[PDB]
Amino acid sequence: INRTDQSLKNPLLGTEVSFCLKSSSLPHHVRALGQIKARNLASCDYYLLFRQVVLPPEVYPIGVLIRAAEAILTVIVSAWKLDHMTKTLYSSVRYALTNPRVRAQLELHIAYQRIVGQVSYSREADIGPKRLGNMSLQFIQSLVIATIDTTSCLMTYNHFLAAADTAKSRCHLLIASVVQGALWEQGSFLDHIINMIDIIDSINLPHDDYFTIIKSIFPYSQGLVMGRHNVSVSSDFASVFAIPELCPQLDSLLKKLLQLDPVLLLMVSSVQKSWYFPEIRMVDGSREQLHKMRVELETPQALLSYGHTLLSIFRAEFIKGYVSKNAKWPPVHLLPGCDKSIKNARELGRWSPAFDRRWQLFEKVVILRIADLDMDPDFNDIVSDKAIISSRRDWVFEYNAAAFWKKYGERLERPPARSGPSRLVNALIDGRLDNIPALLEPFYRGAVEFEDRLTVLVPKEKELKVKGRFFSKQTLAIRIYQVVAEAALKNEVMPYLKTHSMTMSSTALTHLLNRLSHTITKGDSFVINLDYSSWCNGFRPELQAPICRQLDQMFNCGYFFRTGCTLPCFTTFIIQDRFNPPYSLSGEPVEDGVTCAVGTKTMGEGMRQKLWTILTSCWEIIALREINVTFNILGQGDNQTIIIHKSASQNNQLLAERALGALYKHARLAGHNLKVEECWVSDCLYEYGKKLFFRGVPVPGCLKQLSRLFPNLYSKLACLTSSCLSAAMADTSPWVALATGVCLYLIELYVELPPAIIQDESLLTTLCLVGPSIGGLPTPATLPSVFFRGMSDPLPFQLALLQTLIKTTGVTCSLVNRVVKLRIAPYPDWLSLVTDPTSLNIAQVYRPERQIRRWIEEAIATSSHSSRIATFFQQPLTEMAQLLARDLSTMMPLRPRDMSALFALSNVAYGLSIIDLFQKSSTVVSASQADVALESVRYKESIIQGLLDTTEGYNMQPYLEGCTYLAAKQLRRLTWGRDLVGVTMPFVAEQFHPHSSVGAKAELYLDAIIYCPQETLRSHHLTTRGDQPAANLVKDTLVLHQWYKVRKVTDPHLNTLMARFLLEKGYTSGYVNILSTWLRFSSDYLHSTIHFQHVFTYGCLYADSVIRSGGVISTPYLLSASCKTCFEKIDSEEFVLACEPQYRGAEWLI
Amino acid sequence: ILGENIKILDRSMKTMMETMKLMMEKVDLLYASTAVGTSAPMLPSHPAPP
Amino acid sequence: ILGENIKILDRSMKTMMETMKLMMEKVDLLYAST
Amino acid sequence: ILGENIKILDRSMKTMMETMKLMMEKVDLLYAST
Amino acid sequence: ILGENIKILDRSMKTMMETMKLMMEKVDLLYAST
């Protein structure tokens, strides 16, 4: 199989191209050179060629897609009862799909996708010419020939994938931009997007300059917004970048966007993947990487002194946290000359405030053992996909034999097969990871075995850095050492760092973020945003050796941290340039400074992530404390936000200047030179979690997120739905996300399915409206969670959508049956219900694979040759899970919402989670397979055949007439024959019916929820805030038991099951919130938990809709109750388990 | 007073421990610094787990 | 246990006994470079 | 009747401490002078 | 049975007197080297 990837997932490399142009003598070279024109472009200039691709206008008949999208959105809105905005939504979609430029981009995306599909996973290796507009593609092995008229560019399949992904991202960007503009106060801004596209595509500067511009677009936009809307602190961030010099047109366009709306500028400027990715200059990039891993900014002696200072502050913070959490000092030994205050504080077991500014006093305090190193990592970390190298002897397997032979003139002594696994999961299966304490024993001593001292650096894909950034894949032993050290740091010491502890407790985190949002606008809390660039290639052994020693003594693991603290100096580093291999002298790499480097001062990116965080927090606390300013360090990565509170003595400007100077000075004494462009101060803009915040209100990522095993239609649609759901969870409007997702879903269906299905508007609509809940492809339509935050039953919503479709459009019920094609399972499958309470017992035909759990489990049980796995799978976990599910399926008031709860706190749930981790590893599933190429072809054929069928599944007439609540309960009764109760949640739309009170009649006043607006709302109000209002499975089980007893649920059988669950463990005895702060609640309810929150969200969504539809509210509006049958009284009688439990227990897990 | 005269020995031990650890830090870094670019072996710096 | 706390002290010293020795070898072979 | 045989090692301990410090400065100043 | 325990400790201490002076010259002649 050739050309496996269907999307850009690897860095763009050229060394292969250069090797094939001049070197190499394989048969494919003759064919390749034959099909190269005189004007052969370089691979580094591939984007200069794909920009010229033009397709004939309106080649794909996508009008059916337009009509289907219109109908789908109309149906969704009508179901939601927001009939005053369907006009806006479907008009926007039609305009988006009818624009000339937008349609051209969409057609280009479709052509790219079809060309990719026709060649990926092809056993053939010389696919003939393929026409793409004026280009004539041609594939050879993993190389591509692209010709337009006379110029050609010998590429790699990765380059073509990058071009295809660029076209796809531009399609997404344009569609989302039009839809978003249709729903804003300020009109369509699509023209600016098109203008930016044309301007950037018109850039003819060299490779490096063009990609510098593209990289700088976003930070320069931040600087532009910042320099205009700072009130307290100054700003010069925009000055550093050279955009206004290199590309004046882009600068003028960006300034125009800023003038229009800063939020819009941050919106559009955030796109960074919709522009062709660079080709890493591997020679220079690797040379720079290796040099940066061996440079000494600071003298080692000064670094060691500062390391001692950092050790002092680390001791201070740890002791403070330990005291605050246990009201007693940890075991410490006081050195001679210790200060009297320290003695008194230790004796009294308290923490005097004076220490906060006197960390130096802790230089005489040594912390003794407080825990033991957990040299037994849990499966959550071992079972992963991070590629690893088995040992040194496998280094020869990361290069091409032909390239090595040509470059040096000598063969490569590659053994017949790799001596060991290629990934962590394979290592675990093979039994390597069963005596970890012995595996890490060399680290304890301090002499890592020579066989485990090699590191391979890998370039990072989809990064706009021509020089490139490398992350490191490392030997199995070093990888396990890292895992153990990271777990220990994150579990035993990091929670005790008082100042740093308040950045991981979500409660404190959320409270701090809310306070920052409330105070940023008032001009009393500005933020400093440091973004280290050399952080990864930073820390030297000297700086961290003292803290490494203190940790070693703290965990009683002799020299376990110091060994990795000084390891890089004894390690061999190589660059995976598959066609630029290093020389091999005696079976080992030879240092040359470009491809190989034996011994460096740091272990590179990824390694010691947490320790570096601790050190950074330490020196930041030092820098800020000495100037006596309140601070709230907030950050985890190389970019950190420092929140500084106003001081009554001096204005924010002087405070910011002093803080920045101190940070410069102290980062200077760490070998972490901090430059101007990496730090900026602002009182209007700040960033956290890769998510901007302008004047407190978040900047939606509509244009960015919506622009984001073997492949299959189901997998692609699921990824689309998940991305759109994440965007909706962000500050993106639910309507923007929903419309964009509908458009994208229709495009995706158009790419795959044959014309017969596509040109069937009614069928296409029905397909888009049949969600997975009733059995069908994932769709953005059927998603109640888009508009809500809590758990919600999707079934009533799906039935409501189908009912509305039937009532409104010309689709007949027989067609719905044809598409839905209901197929009740022959026998109950209790495990599926337990692991997903709100699902019907139906055959999920479109699912990529069903019952595969036993296949993976069975494959793991055999062909293992391990010990941990053997004890982990003594008897089939799937069979026991089914047993437990059946056991829990004997509650006379069968309430799956609790069956899932009970099943959750059992060892079998953890075992199924581990199996899920195993299958998630694409290596395990491929190992289980016993190719995938035919599997996809068969899969595509089956679905294409399935819906082309004209067979019926089950007469749905009785299930699409009444309340979706009652209908859903009837459906569950039918599909399990047990009158399932306790999980159906009504649909807010049918439960109520919004009414404006302008025309309200006395009949409507009897019962409803009223919404009182303080003043008339407007589009401006939608973006400005107002004023109106392990063993832990034992504690959760205990609180569940306390919950039951408090409610007086005391059942002998349930008690026995719960006690068994205990003894097997060992124990024995925000989108709309801004408007929400603009209205007032109403508790004047008669009947009606969490569901009420959904009603409130719907009520305020009505106002959002009427405002966004060019309307205004003059009087309070009510929410009458329309469907009475959608109301019920719940008693929750008891969990009468009936038949006695038979699960027993595992006792092997944990 | 049979134990107080012993605790001061322990503190004397712990004081030496820091002395040894500082020696190790310095010596370890000297050797590591000269080991860059050479095939110098990675000598152990701690006897063994008990 | 009055004698155990000193018993543990012994082997704690024994760790130093060779902890230097392994430093002695590395320092000694450092001379051979010069 | 046994404390008399332990006061003679602590007095020697101090004598062995002063040597340890007496060489501490010697070793440290050697690192800086490099 | 402490008397034997003391003596074994005492000899181990005597292993510190000669070992150090067996490396005092070694480490200090490094200064003579530089």
Ligand SMILES: [Zn+2]
């Ligand atoms: Zn109803």
